[PDB]
Design a protein around this ligand. Structure first.
Ligand SMILES: [Mg+2]
Ligand SMILES: [Mg+2]
Lengths: 305, 289
């Protein structure tokens, strides 16, 4: 979204890490790679042409807090998922051990909350509550992930806790800071977040025409029964249901090929996509009144891969 | 300490956990054992005889926040519990911070900075622990970040809440915290005063060159210094018994204790103006183990 502002947020994060004054932490931080900063792009979109410089800095600080929280959650998630990689490069836990990845995440969380306390109680509570739900969602995700899950309601709760509510809280917080209608943007954030994670789960099992890279097929192998698998399970005959369950947490090329044929057989890809489009439509609906081209741009683009 | 108050805090932690509304979390929480709640005792000691009910409740909420931060750090520290520990730790930290959100900027910043510092401390401990350490200043920096500063911030925070001299109590907490951790390191290699039950000897084995080891290293001859360094991060009875004999040979136990007494005295001296019987008792007891 706006390069110069994202660049300023990137630099604020670096400054905040240096403020911790620890050569060891500087070392750990140097191994974390760039971020798309999707959340900052969404939040920055609420800024006005005439936002005063003092308020703009506060807004950049808010975006910095949100990105650091996001980074902290990813650091802990990589530990819990025993991930050795994050975007083709070695994870922090792979390079410095689980303990360091965990502490580094705590450092990101605490430094972020420290700065957050200067935002006021309304914003501080919205974001700190979002971090509480992110942690509840993470626990829910691995407990539900212990065995094949066919209860779609548990899936929806996890998506909302681990992804949707945080984006909702981030947008609501920026609206509050900029004295905008917090309800409208919280609503846009929640639905955008739901669509975003559904498409993300979709991209794990189906090709992104735009890239030649093949889908990772990382989810089911890791115990996550995402929407595609839930919708497929509801259409499979008894025999195939047995097979799908037997493939839970298994890892092989043949299982991937079988799964792709089954999704095609029951039109799961389009069915999954349509579920996300409902949320995408709701997001656009929420900001119908406003005239935010950036948000409308992002809300439409998430649905097209 | 005040057992009725500690009980109320214990119950607040339980109700705060239930407010998260997660059966999975309730299950993980039921596995958490009791706590001595040393930090609540120090903080509760600042309350006046006739503190009003509204303020009292705020004070209890503050102790609850501090005890949950303490539990969260212990959980993450045990990762050095599977990933259940990392998860439950985040739950404790986040709930505590959410409630801290309602406490006013000064207290919110004091405690969040404390968590930042103790996390920095943990990291310093791991990195410094990659090889034998003879630099005592690195040890003190670690003790301050990982243990002393949080106790300092907890007392400072309660002082602010109760409108007392924050400076006096922060000073008490910092010094008490240094003594506390020194004694803790001593208890890892010496027998405790009335219990059966031998010392764990977990520190040096884990790569931590604690005060006893630093003071010993300073007295050993070249031959024994070489042995000690070679025993770094090793686990054997031979090493344990050799170390015990060396501590005795150079009066290290007593030298370590005197060091802790210095901070204990500085702590007492900070609240001398005060006449706080509970705090004085604690600073004293910390040293008698
Ligand atoms: Mg994914
Ligand atoms: Mg110890």
């Amino acid at each position: 979204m706006q390069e110069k502002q994202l660049k300023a947020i990137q630099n604020k994060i670096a400054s905040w890490i240096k403020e911790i004054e620890s050569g060891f932490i500087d070392e750990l931080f140097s191994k974390i790679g760039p971020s798309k900063m999707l959340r900052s792009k969404l939040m920055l979109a609420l800024l006005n042409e005439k936002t005063d410089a003092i308020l703009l800095d506060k807004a950049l600080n808010l975006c910095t807090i949100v990105e650091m929280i996001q980074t902290a959650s990813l650091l802990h998630d990589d530990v819990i998922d025993k991930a050795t990689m994050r975007r083709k490069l070695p994870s922090i836990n792979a390079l410095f051990g689980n303990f360091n990845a965990v502490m580094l995440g705590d450092v990101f969380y605490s430094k972020a909350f420290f700065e957050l306390s200067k935002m006021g109680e309304l914003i501080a509570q919205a974001l700190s509550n979002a971090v509480l739900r992110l942690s509840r969602g993470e626990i829910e995700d691995v407990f539900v992930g212990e065995c094949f899950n066919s209860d779609k309601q548990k899936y929806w709760r996890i998506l909302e806790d681990k992804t949707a509510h945080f984006i909702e809280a981030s947008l609501k917080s920026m609206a509050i800071l900029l004295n905008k209608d917090a309800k409208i943007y919280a609503d846009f954030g929640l639905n955008f977040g739901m669509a975003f994670q559904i498409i993300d789960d979709l991209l794990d099992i189906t090709q992104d025409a735009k890239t030649l890279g093949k889908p990772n097929f990382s989810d089911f192998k890791e115990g996550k029964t995402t929407l595609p698998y839930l919708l497929l399970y509801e259409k499979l005959n008894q025999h195939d249901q047995g097979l799908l369950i037997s493939y839970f947490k298994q890892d092989s090329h043949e299982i991937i090929e079988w799964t792709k044929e089954k999704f095609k057989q029951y039109g799961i890809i389009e069915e999954t996509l349509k579920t996300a489009q409902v949320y995408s439509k709701k997001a656009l609906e929420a900001i119908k009144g406003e005239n935010n081209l950036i948000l409308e741009k992002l809300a439409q683009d998430v649905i097209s891969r």
